[PDB]
Design a binder for these strands. Structure first.
Ligand SMILES: [K+]
Ligand SMILES: [K+]
Ligand SMILES: [Mg+2]
Ligand SMILES: [Mg+2]
Ligand SMILES: [Mg+2]
Ligand SMILES: [Mg+2]
Ligand SMILES: [Mg+2]
Ligand SMILES: [Mg+2]
Ligand SMILES: [Mg+2]
Ligand SMILES: [Mg+2]
Ligand SMILES: [Mg+2]
Ligand SMILES: [Zn+2]
Lengths: 217, 25, 129, 97, 81, 150, 87, 96, 121, 206
RNA sequence: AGGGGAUCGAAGAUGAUCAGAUACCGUCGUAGUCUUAACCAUAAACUAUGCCGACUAGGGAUCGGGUGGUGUUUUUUUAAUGACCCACUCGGCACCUUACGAGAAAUCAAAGUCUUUGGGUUCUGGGGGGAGUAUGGUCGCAAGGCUGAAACUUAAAGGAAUUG
RNA sequence: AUGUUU
């Protein structure tokens, strides 16, 4: 089974929290991948690459394997994990776990008018990792994801269908390009818009609403 | 070779070239 | 030396907002500065601003409300035609639904939306979003 | 890269500092860069303070000190262990021991 | 901080500030009425007087210039106009 | 700041916000104008006239009491100099440095400072010729600099 | 953000900092929500009834959340003379 | 600023600076100097006929081996002598 | 030397964590209890464990030791109260029933409280 | 919104003044503390005990808002506050961290550590920087006993108090526990002096 | 080109090491080192960080100036400057911590306020060599300085950092 | 004090 720790996870397994949007609204730190698994059952994972990293020690070649994974549902949610382990398989599994933990929401929007079911981003956005700067620009319908294959895969797993991309820096560094694209994705719900200007009543945390979930009877 | 000594050798070469061009006319 | 008091004012406002301050003092507080601030305040990116009359060029204290992502000048003040207003908005604004390219036109200082609905153009002054 | 935040010397606001000569090898070093140590040794340490005080014709002589400011170049100071190689973070520490 | 009344700074901070860095710049100098050893006027002397001012109708030195505020000849009364 | 230096000094007068005479000031505008004309006839430049007025009298600003600047008062009363005071003092400093230079000839620092002073002279003279304070052919020459400051 | 015919098509309308009005993101683990209990009829601290303030990780990292909470509390009550506008 | 003039009347300086700095580009400098015509035995042309003069085996550069069976050719167009590789397994026997 | 390794020290701490209402501070009646409540596979290691447990429980009577909680630290803490009781809460005493404060503290109290016994020098 | 019963009384006012809570740090004081009453000579700054009391009451209301008392963690690595937090977590249902904090106690959900509180209170932000940093890693609000030279980073409620004195530290913790109990209901009437005297929280070296 | 030339000392001479040692080391020693009158115009001429302007953290020292204090010490006769102490302030050489922020990083209060890209302005660079070479021009007594290619060649060269 | 090369 699960046997949860992380009273947030306890609430998720108890069914008090039923949408990950609540976790996102209260910025609740998730520590078990099972929370993400039960709140987003339709979450597919794509391994982007495995590369050997090498440490020199006394004839050297410690040759650990590092795997980049993107998990996501093509509706609002992606996460990105990067994990190094002794074997490709275990690195992939731990990376899937890390990506699920890192799952964040994306804010989709419209390029032009308000015709239903947002297809693009709400604003221009930029993410940076190392020397790699990835910029996402809202695109009209039918534009598709204009990005290099890895970033395009991350974006369709995010659920974006129309976006323009621009890049600078050593984009052949796949890890930095994916991390920059992930930062750009995440910043969409950090960019304050006039339609978000309106002040909300600051709801109460689920951890407080159901406080009888930290005990051992 | 050191850049300083490369420059010195090149200057000596330049001096010799100037001298040869001077002797010629 | 000072070449753009509007640039100095907008830079001070940007720095105060990105450091989280709710108020910013700007000097020397010219007429173009006041008009630009009036546009920003009409669209609600700043709060109230008060002009302090020293018998020099003056000062302004602006109240920021946390809704400003960036205000900036476009220097030089490029001549902008009606059809180039769209290129400027595309280049400067984060989206097509909000933000403003602010121009100086002979119909007055104004954002690009009321510029294009008065069918006037001029020189580009700055932007706010 | 740049190994030391200011430089391996102490000169900011100066431009040129007149040199000094290393006491050990005579290498010219800018005065601010030279490693300077003061020596206030007793004129007679020599295992023989008691012997000199006995041989002295003066009671309570209060034998003097020899004063000497030594200026070492970097090479000579390192070689003679007046100064030692320190870790990257220990270098950023200017207090004496 | 992050919230302060820039339009109404406290008198203490305003007096601490440099004369050009107050909310509105203004001088911290003043004018004094120094009692002449004679009569017919109380001589007006700038606080930061650069001149060795003498009485209008006499030749006694009222102040000696300094780097900042002037001196007062070590016998004089001085109202702070 | 410091057109010919790396100095960033801000020290200057901070004139008051009040554009009217101080309440404790009772002298007439005619009386201060008369004192100004008297000092000008005694040969003082507007700067030292203002210094004397503020130090020995209570006239904080001749422009706030008489409603006119001291140089404008002197010009209206016919006591203006043939060249402005700042230009005159710049040329006097240039003459002094040039005399020291023709007596020393190894003071390269003085040569450099004289170049700076003459650059300032030429910039100020160009301004004055632009605003027609000086004749359009007014010229500063090293050998006649004394000839035009005396 | 709604679509045509005005139905909310955006998930998770985010919270905004009570001090600086910036958006509290999902990964801002330095941000903090403070509940101050309400007092009725000489104490007893009614459970579930608070005054709620959201402070952004930026403010807390700048070390200004204390002053900002002083201001916001005192504006809501909860503090009479701690924070002054003039300084 | 950014080390370049921004003034509205700075177009002459901007374009002159671009003109000066375009000379640091390989392609621009080659095209404007006309290297292909003076240098480049093919006078800026795709192909050139020539007369073989000698068969030659040049030993491939390290770390390789297997001398490469080229031919010295004298171009009909201008007269220069160029070494041309003969690409295939064999295919030297078809050139005399 | 006579330093005990981790497989001695940690096992002793684990024994004392759950068997404090158990084997006393005597080694002979310590090793015997170890024999029946611990699967020690060698008498020498058993002797080591029992000796270190004897030492731990002998020094337990001189103050609590780090990393050891047998659900008695809380009890003894709540038991040991008021080392200086029923004398002075530092209230209305230790003076002429006043507070020996400075002038600025005096103005501090004058800001709101009209009733404070003060001896402001 | 708090009644004159919650106003500062002469009894606990002179209790603070006797414990020397108002004796702030020297001329060196963090320029984020407007809790400073006029600076006396010898450099020592006087802490406004009115503001100290108001902040203590606000912190007590924040603690009382917490539904489960065990989800409130009192932390002190300094000896002068360890007995204070132990007695505080005895009187209130809080969870004490006295002595070492074991970095990784808020992340790293491994046993012997990893409480997951809703609020953290620290005796000294400087000496408990690690706990404050971890709280900033996991969204935990922080109350801190702050001297005028204490760092304010990731400290949401600063109770201005001298922390160089064991008397001051113990008394502040004692008043915090008192107000928490009063707000809860343990102390039915906020007029009695809470018979347990403010020495059970002080340090005892011998 | 005059003067001066103690010292040290390119060259040079010698002693010793060494396989060689026309190097390091030792002893001398010319030019030079110093100065006057003229040239030369180059340095890792470095902070390898153009200049002007504005803004964005905290802190304590320190230099110069100024202001204030129930201040300490110092005497002239009230008072006084002077030195010092405390607080503030302007300007400067810097420094410490933290970085919202920046950066490839080292690190950086500027190298920040840059893909949310525009305050003004000058100069410079465009893979590594060939090469600061050839040539022409110009300056210089000369040494050289400034300007400055091409043919040809090459898949790296290079920066910061990590573990060995 | 000297100790080259791969
Ligand atoms: K091969
Ligand atoms: K000589
Ligand atoms: Mg190195
Ligand atoms: Mg130099
Ligand atoms: Mg200035
Ligand atoms: Mg200039
Ligand atoms: Mg050079
Ligand atoms: Mg250089
Ligand atoms: Mg190149
Ligand atoms: Mg390297
Ligand atoms: Mg080899
Ligand atoms: Zn040496």
């Amino acid at each position: 089974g699960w046997v949860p720790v992380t009273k947030l996870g306890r609430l998720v397994k108890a069914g008090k929290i039923t949408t990950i949007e609540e976790i996102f609204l209260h910025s609740l730190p998730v520590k078990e991948f099972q929370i993400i698994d039960t709140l987003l059952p339709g979450l597919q994972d794509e391994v982007m690459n495995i590369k050997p990293v090498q440490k020199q020690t006394r004839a050297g070649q410690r040759t650990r394997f590092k795997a980049v994974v993107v998990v996501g549902d093509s509706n609002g949610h992606v996460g990105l994990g990067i994990k190094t382990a002794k074997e490709v398989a275990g690195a992939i599994r731990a990376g899937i776990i890390i990506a699920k933990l890192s799952v964040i929401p994306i804010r989709r929007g419209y390029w032009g008018t308000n015709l239903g079911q947002p297809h693009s981003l709400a604003t221009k956005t930029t993410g940076k990792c190392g020397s790699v700067t990835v910029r996402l620009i809202p695109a009209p319908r039918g534009s598709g994801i204009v990005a290099s294959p890895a970033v395009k895969k991350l974006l369709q797993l995010a659920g974006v269908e129309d976006v323009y991309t621009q890049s600078n820096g050593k984009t052949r560094t796949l890890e930095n390009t994916l991390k920059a694209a992930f930062v750009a994705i995440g910043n969409t719900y950090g960019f304050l818009t006039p339609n978000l200007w309106a002040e909300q009543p600051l709801p109460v945390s689920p951890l407080d609403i159901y406080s009888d979930e930290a005990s051992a009877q | 070779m050191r850049a300083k000594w490369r420059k010195k050798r090149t200057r000596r070469l330049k001096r010799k070239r100037r001298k040869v061009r001077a002797r010629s006319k | 030396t000072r070449s753009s008091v509007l640039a100095d004012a907008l830079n001070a406002i940007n720095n105060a907002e990105k450091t989280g301050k709710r108020q910013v003092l700007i000097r020397p507080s010219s007429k173009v500065i006041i008009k630009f601030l009036q546009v920003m305040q009409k669209h609600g990116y700043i709060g109230e601003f008060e002009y302090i009359d020293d018998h020099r060029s003056g000062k302004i204290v602006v109240q920021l409300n946390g809704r400003l992502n960036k205000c900036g000048v476009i220097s030089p003040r490029f001549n902008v035609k009606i059809g180039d207003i769209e290129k400027w908005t595309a280049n400067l604004l984060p989206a097509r639904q909000f933000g403003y390219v602010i121009l100086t036109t002979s119909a007055g200082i104004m954002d690009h939306e009321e510029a294009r609905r008065k069918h006037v153009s001029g020189k580009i002054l700055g932007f706010v979003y | 890269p740049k190994k030391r935040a200011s430089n391996g010397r102490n000169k900011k606001g100066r431009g040129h500092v007149k040199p000094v000569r290393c006491v050990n090898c005579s290498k010219s070093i800018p005065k601010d860069k030279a490693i300077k140590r003061m020596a206030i040794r007793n004129i007679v340490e020599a295992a023989a303070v008691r012997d000199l005080s006995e041989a002295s014709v003066y009671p309570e002589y209060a034998l003097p000190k020899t004063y000497n400011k030594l200026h070492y170049c970097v090479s000579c100071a390192i070689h003679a262990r007046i100064v030692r190689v320190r870790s990257r973070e220990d270098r950023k520490n200017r207090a004496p021991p | 901080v992050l919230v302060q009344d820039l339009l109404h700074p406290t008198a203490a901070s305003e007096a601490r500030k440099h004369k050009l860095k107050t909310l509105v710049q203004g001088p911290r100098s003043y004018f004094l009425d120094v009692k002449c050893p004679g009569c017919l006027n109380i001589t007006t002397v700038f606080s930061h007087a650069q001149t060795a001012v003498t009485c209008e109708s006499c030749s006694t030195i009222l102040c000696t210039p300094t780097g900042g505020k002037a001196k007062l000849s070590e016998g004089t009364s001085f109202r702070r106009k | 700041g410091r057109m010919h230096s790396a100095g960033k000094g801000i020290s200057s007068s901070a004139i008051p916000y009040s554009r009217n005479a101080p309440a404790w000031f009772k002298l007439s505008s005619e009386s201060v104008i008369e004192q100004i004309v008297k000092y000008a006839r005694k040969g003082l430049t507007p700067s030292q006239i203002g210094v004397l007025l503020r130090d020995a009298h209570g006239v904080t600003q001749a422009r706030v009491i008489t409603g006119n600047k001291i140089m404008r008062i002197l010009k209206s009363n016919g006591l203006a100099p043939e060249i402005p005071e700042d230009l005159y003092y710049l040329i006097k400093k240039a003459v002094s440095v040039r005399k020291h230079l023709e007596r020393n000839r190894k003071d390269k620092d003085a040569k450099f400072r004289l170049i700076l002073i003459e650059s300032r002279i030429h910039r100020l003279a160009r301004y004055y010729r632009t605003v027609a304070v000086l004749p359009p052919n007014w010229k500063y020459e090293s050998a006649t600099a004394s000839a035009l400051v005396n | 953000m709604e679509n045509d015919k005005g139905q909310l098509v955006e998930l998770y309308v985010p919270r905004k900092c009570s001090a600086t009005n910036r958006i509290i993101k999902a990964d801002d683990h330095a941000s903090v929500q403070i509940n101050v209990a309400k007092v009725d009829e000489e104490g007893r601290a009614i459970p579930g009834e608070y005054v709620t303030y959201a402070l952004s990780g930026y403010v807390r990292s700048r070390g200004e959340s204390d002053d900002s909470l002083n201001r916001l509390a005192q504006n809501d009550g909860l503090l009479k003379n701690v924070w002054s506008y003039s300084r | 600023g950014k080390g370049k003039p921004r003034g509205l009347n700075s177009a002459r300086k901007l374009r002159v600076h671009r003109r000066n700095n375009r000379w640091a580009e390989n392609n621009y400098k080659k095209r404007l100097l006309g290297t292909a015509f003076k240098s480049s035995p093919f006078g800026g042309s795709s192909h050139a006929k020539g007369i073989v003069l000698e068969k030659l085996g040049i030993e491939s550069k390290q770390p390789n081996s297997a001398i490469r069976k080229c031919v010295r050719v004298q171009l009909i167009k201008n007269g220069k002598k160029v070494t041309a590789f003969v690409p295939n397994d064999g295919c030297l026997n078809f050139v005399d | 030397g006579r330093v005990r390794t981790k497989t001695v020290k940690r096992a002793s701490k684990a024994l004392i964590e759950r068997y404090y209402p158990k084997l006393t501070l005597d080694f002979q009646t310590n090793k015997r209890l170890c024999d029946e409540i611990a699967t020690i596979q060698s008498k020498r290691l058993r002797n080591k464990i029992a000796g270190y447990t004897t030492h731990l429980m002998k020094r337990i009577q001189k103050g609590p030791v780090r990393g050891i909680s047998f659900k008695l630290q809380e009890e003894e803490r709540e038991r040991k109260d008021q080392y200086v009781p029923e004398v002075s809460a530092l209230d209305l005493s230790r003076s002429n029933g006043v507070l020996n404060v400075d002038n600025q503290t005096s103005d501090l109290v004058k800001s709101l409280g009209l009733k404070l016994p003060l001896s402001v020098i | 919104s708090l009644p004159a019963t919650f106003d500062l009384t002469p009894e606990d006012a002179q209790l603070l003044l006797a414990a020397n809570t108002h004796l702030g740090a020297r001329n060196v004081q963090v320029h984020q503390e407007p809790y400073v009453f006029n600076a006396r000579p010898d450099g020592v700054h006087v802490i406004n005990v009115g503001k100290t009391w108001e902040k203590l009451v606000l912190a007590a209301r924040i603690i009382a808002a917490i539904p489960n008392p065990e989800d409130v963690v009192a932390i002190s690595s300094r000896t002068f506050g360890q007995r204070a937090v132990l007695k505080f977590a005895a009187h209130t249902g809080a969870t004490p961290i006295a002595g070492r904090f074991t970095p990784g106690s808020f992340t790293n959900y491994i046993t012997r550590s990893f409480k997951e509180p809703r609020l953290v209170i620290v005796t000294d932000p400087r000496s408990d920087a690690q706990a404050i940093k971890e709280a900033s890693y996991v969204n935990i609000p922080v109350i801190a006993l702050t001297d005028l030279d204490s760092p304010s980073e990731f400290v949401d409620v600063a109770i201005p108090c001298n922390n160089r004195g064991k008397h001051s530290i113990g008394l502040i913790w004692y008043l915090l526990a008192r107000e928490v109990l009063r707000l809860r209901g343990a102390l039915v009437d906020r007029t009695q002096p809470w018979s347990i005297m403010p020495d059970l929280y002080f340090y005892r070296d011998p």
